[PDB]
């Protein structure tokens, strides 16, 4: 049983020592990434039916 507890303690120690950035920077990064690829999302902004593979398009 001591081995399990030692493993858990060492794992917690390894997980505690990591460089974390403030939540503001991560929020800004997510916002910026979502904004950069906004025009490339078919689901977000509907695309004209002429280029929709499921409404009216040419297959082969």
Partner 1 sequence: ELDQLRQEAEQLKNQIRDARKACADATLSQITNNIDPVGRIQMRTRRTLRGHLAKIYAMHWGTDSRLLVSASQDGKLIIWDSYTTNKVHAIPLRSSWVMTCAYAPSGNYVACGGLDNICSIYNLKTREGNVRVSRELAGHTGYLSCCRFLDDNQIVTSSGDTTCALWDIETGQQTTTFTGHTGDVMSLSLAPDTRLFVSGACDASAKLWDVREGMCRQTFTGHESDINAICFFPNGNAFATGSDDATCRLFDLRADQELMTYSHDNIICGITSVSFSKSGRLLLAGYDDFNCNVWDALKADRAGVLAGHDNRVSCLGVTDDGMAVATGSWDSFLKIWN
CB of 50 to partner 1, least distance (A): 13
Site for partner 1 contains 50 (CB under 8 A) = no
Tokens 């009216």 correspond to 56
Can you read off the two tokens belonging to residue 52? Answer: 């929709």
Backbone angles phi, psi at 9, to 5 degrees: -65, -45
Residue 18 or 50 with smaller CB distance to partner 1: 18
Task: Work out the number of other CB atoms within 10 angstroms of the CB of residue 47.
Answer: 13
Binding region for partner 1 (CB under 8 A):
1-2, 5-6, 8-9, 11-16, 18, 20-31, 33-34, 37-38, 40-44, 47, 52-55, 59
């Amino acid at each position: 049983s001591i081995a399990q507890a030692r493993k858990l303690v060492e794992q917690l120690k390894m997980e505690a020592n990591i460089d974390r950035i403030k939540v503001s920077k991560a929020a800004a990064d997510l916002m910026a990434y979502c904004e950069a690829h906004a025009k490339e999302d078919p689901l977000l902004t509907p695309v004209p039916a002429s280029e929709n593979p499921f409404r009216e398009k040419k297959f082969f």
